[PDB]
Amino acid sequence: PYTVVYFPVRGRCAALRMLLADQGQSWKEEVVTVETWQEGSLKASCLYGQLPKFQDGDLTLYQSNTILRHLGRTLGLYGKDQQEAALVDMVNDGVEDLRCKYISLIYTNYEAGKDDYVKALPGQLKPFETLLSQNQGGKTFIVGDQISFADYNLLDLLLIHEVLAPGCLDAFPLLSAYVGRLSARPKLKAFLASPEYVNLPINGNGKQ
Amino acid sequence: PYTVVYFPVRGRCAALRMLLADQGQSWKEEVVTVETWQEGSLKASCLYGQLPKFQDGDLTLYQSNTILRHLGRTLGLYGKDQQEAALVDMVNDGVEDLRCKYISLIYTNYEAGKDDYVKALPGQLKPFETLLSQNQGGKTFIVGDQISFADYNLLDLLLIHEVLAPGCLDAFPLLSAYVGRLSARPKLKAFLASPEYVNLPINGNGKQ
Numbered sequence: 486p487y488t489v490v491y492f493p494v495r496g497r498c499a500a501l502r503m504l505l506a507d508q509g510q511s512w513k514e515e516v517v518t519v520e521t522w523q524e525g526s527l528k529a530s531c532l533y534g535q536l537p538k539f540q541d542g543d544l545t546l547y548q549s550n551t552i553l554r555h556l557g558r559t560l561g562l563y564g565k566d567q568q569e570a571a572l573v574d575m576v577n578d579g580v581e582d583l584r585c586k587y588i589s590l591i592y593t594n595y596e597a598g599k600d601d602y603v604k605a606l607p608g609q610l611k612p613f614e615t616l617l618s619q620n621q622g623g624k625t626f627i628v629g630d631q632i633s634f635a636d637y638n639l640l641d642l643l644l645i646h647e648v649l650a651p652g653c654l655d656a657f658p659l660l661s662a663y664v665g666r667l668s669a670r671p672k673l674k675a676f677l678a679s680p681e682y683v684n685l686p687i688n689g690n691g692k693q
Numbered sequence: 694p695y696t697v698v699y700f701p702v703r704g705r706c707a708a709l710r711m712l713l714a715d716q717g718q719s720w721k722e723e724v725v726t727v728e729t730w731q732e733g734s735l736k737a738s739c740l741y742g743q744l745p746k747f748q749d750g751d752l753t754l755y756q757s758n759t760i761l762r763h764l765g766r767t768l769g770l771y772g773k774d775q776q777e778a779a780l781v782d783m784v785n786d787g788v789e790d791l792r793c794k795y796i797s798l799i800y801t802n803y804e805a806g807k808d809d810y811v812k813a814l815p816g817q818l819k820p821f822e823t824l825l826s827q828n829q830g831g832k833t834f835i836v837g838d839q840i841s842f843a844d845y846n847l848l849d850l851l852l853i854h855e856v857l858a859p860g861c862l863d864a865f866p867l868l869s870a871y872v873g874r875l876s877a878r879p880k881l882k883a884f885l886a887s888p889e890y891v892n893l894p895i896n897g898n899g900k901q
């Protein structure tokens with residue numbers, strides 16, 4: 486019932502794929518080559534001229550956080566009540582902010598910008614440590630006592646940052662433990678070890 | 694029940710203010726001056742070192758779209774069902790994407806970047822005219838038959854863009870009429886005419 490339409494990269498679909506995999510949901514991958522994209526037709530049919538495109542039956546969605554929120558809603562991964570739902574959003578928006586900075590570094594300014602980025606990184610990661618500390622001493626999820634779509638997105642962000650700056654989580658014991666804990670969830674663990682995950686690059690331009 | 698903590702500018706609070714005013718809600722403005730921000734204490738206390746900060750009872754929120762979603766969820770401005778909520782998110786994420794570009798122009802590249810931004814603008818607005826075209830002929834709201842938080846956000850986006858690039862909606866009959874229709878809603882109309890809105894600059898650097 487789900488289709489993911491994307492480039493042959495992890496990128497903005499990593500988190501939503503982890504979510505689907507961990508939740509035992511089945512989906513189709515439709516792969517878009519750089520050549521098809523450059524041909525221009527598919528791009529012109531996309532609402533905002535970008536991928537991912539996501540189909541849930543006849544419901545067609547664009548925007549990676551739209552897809553996360555939609556799956557969060559329909560799969561009960563959006564907090565236990567209205568207050569938790571808002572906290573989940575606050576976490577996801579912070580994740581999205583850091584993701585945009587990471588995307589900027591990777592695609593527009595890797596060589597000149599990397600040292601500065603890594604130096605500023607602890608400052609950008611600290612709010613997630615703080616959230617964890619304020620929730621059951623960081624022993625469960627980013628919000629409340631059940632997983633949310635923000636957990637999968639946060640997890641992705643942290644995983645890609647380790648690759649960017651090995652040991653960056655050494656300064657953050659709760660985030661470190663959290664990555665280990667979520668990454669060990671059985672369906673998730675299997676997915677992250679699988680060719681369909683491992684054989685895709687993180688980004689489209691060979692940088693990580 | 695609500696408190697908005699922000700600089701004396703419209704910026705990222707404009708949409709949530711329009712929402713509150715139109716929905717007959719009461720709120721307190723806590724105005725933060727340049728001197729107070731520079732002092733550092735308030736900034737250090739903010740989850741992501743940014744304003745707005747929003748209070749509603751004992752709930753403290755940060756991130757303008759988290760605030761919009763919370764108000765949307767709690768006041769019933771988030772579509773009629775899950776499928777509509779997904780479309781609402783899709784519109785809001787698209788509004789936010791263009792807000793991000795607008796902000797980057799205003800704050801970091803106004804004199805060099807304006808000509809390229811304005812030339813690109815029609816292709817950036819067109820998706821919203823298309824959405825309107827596909828929903829009851831553009832006669833109601835951006836999604837469905839009831840107002841949503843995305844409508845308030847889109848209306849703001851459009852109003853600030855008419856200041857930036859006067860006439861930018863002229864080629865878009867549905868958006869043009871939507872702006873007039875929503876702007877005529879009695880409480881919103883009163884708010885938009887009030888000194889509280891009119892006498893604040895859109896941005897914090899004198900550019901618009």
Ligand SMILES: C=C(CC)C(=O)c1ccc(OCC(=O)O)c(Cl)c1Cl
Binds near residue numbers: 592689
């Ligand atoms: C195929 C490509 C050209 C479109 C390409 O290398 C590329 C550029 C930007 C991208 O994302 C940016 C983002 O905002 O996620 C991604 Cl995921 C890719 Cl694969």
Ligand SMILES: C=C(CC)C(=O)c1ccc(OCC(=O)O)c(Cl)c1Cl
Binds near residue numbers: 896897
């Ligand atoms: C505090 C400032 C430095 C003098 C300043 O002017 C400033 C910078 C970025 C901002 O974010 C833009 C947005 O609307 O998100 C805003 Cl709202 C302001 Cl007021």
Ligand SMILES: [Ca+2]
Binds near residue numbers: 786
């Ligand atoms: Ca986006």
Ligand SMILES: [Ca+2]
Binds near residue numbers: 757
């Ligand atoms: Ca943000």
Ligand SMILES: [Ca+2]
Binds near residue numbers: 768769770771839840
């Ligand atoms: Ca309603």
Ligand SMILES: [Cl-]
Binds near residue numbers: 789794
């Ligand atoms: Cl952006």
Ligand SMILES: [Pt+2]
Binds near residue numbers: 585793
């Ligand atoms: Pt951005």
